[PDB]
Amino acid sequence: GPHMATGQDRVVALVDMDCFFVQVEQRQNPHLRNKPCAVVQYKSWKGGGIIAVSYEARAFGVTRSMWADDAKKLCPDLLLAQVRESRGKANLTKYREASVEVMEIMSRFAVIERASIDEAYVDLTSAVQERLQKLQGQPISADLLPSTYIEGLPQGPTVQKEGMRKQGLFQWLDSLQIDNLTSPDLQLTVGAVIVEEMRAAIERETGFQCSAGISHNKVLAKLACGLNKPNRQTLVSHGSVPQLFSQMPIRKIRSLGGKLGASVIEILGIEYMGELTQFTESQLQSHFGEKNGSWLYAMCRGIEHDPVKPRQLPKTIGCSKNFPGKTALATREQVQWWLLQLAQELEERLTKDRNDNDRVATQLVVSIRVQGDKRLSSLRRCCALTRYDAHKMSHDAFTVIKNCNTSGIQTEWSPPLTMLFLCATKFSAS
DNA sequence: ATTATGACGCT
DNA sequence: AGCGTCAT
Ligand SMILES: Nc1ncnc2c1ncn2[C@H]1C[C@H](O)[C@@H](COP(=O)(O)OP(=O)(O)OP(=O)(O)O)O1
Ligand SMILES: [Ca+2]
Ligand code: NA
Which residues are involved in binding Mn(2+) 2? Predict the structure, then answer.
């Protein structure tokens, strides 16, 4: 009853760029705009691997992970942009720099948590309170929410998409109590107004379009964001949760897309998030652990407490390359040449990071994969990172892995290496 | 022969 | 520490 928390204390948004790497390339090259197009890495093996796909191309069935040669079978007119190659490897700098553009704009509105290269969470609780003060009881016009969907509406007693959106929005606004500064639904609505403003600023100042979710926590905001893409935002209210979750496959919720989610389904014999409500917190903890059980018990009721962390910069800076099939590294000279290539890219990124961000990495992590292993990483070792010098870092990495070599011969490497990874970590202010 | 990342949890 | 899970 009155002591039952409802997880309505915060306003949280998740902003996610639409087909991000494609937009970066389309901004640069106007010939790619409004076309079926994809971004690919490498080119020799099956036309290259697709890592991003425009919405026009998705209509033909083109997807991430598809080889370009295969994508061309579905979409013969597909246009392609290639990821830059430097020092023999894919180099993602252009996309990292575009990400900084967007993150810096978002940061003007609120503190953000960088969740990935193209998405950020925002805690809008304080901004909403402020805006509610300015509004002074004044209602919120539909004109302020030109790209907002209200999940679950319209409902109750037009056949076009935009018409439906407006009907739902009208029902929502019609029902609002703008006289109460503490009404969670009103807070979410004001949150959505601010997010329209943020999204407009991003598009004005970068050219990039995005989608967003607005709810009371990170998990619902993320879920919401995906409900209407591209170039739209979605508000998921606390009240919308029972219906939304009643047919929502468990795997759709962030963190349940893998083995844990599969075990929830298997052990409990259920399919949808809403079905979780019928178990006690102790029952869930018994199957999935203390932490997971409490989390599931709250989450299936729309409640989640993970904070939006004040962190705009990545915590690690890493460089990685696979060496598949016949290209696996089988000589010491090969291994050393590639560690150097990786170290040179890392040095470049670290030096820029130190100048931009007033910090220095203190640990170097070296990881490899050996041919045969089904695991993505076979071995990981750390050593001190005391100088931003590529030759030193590569020599140091060779030293820490050189004992993985089975070959009785000094010059040969066995089993061959199918992955190298260097990662700078443990930053300190400088 | 997906690849290149990056955060966080366990013991 | 080193490994695993999950995610973009
Ligand atoms: N598995 C991956 N491997 C390499 N790069 C990836 C991978 N997944 C995502 N990326 C890169 C390319 C994407 O443009 C960018 C953001 O990913 P993501 O948000 O999942 O999709 P997207 O921005 O391309 O499309 P959407 O409009 O569906 O969000 O990160
Ligand atoms: Ca995206
Ligand atoms: Na994303």
Answer: 16, 118-119
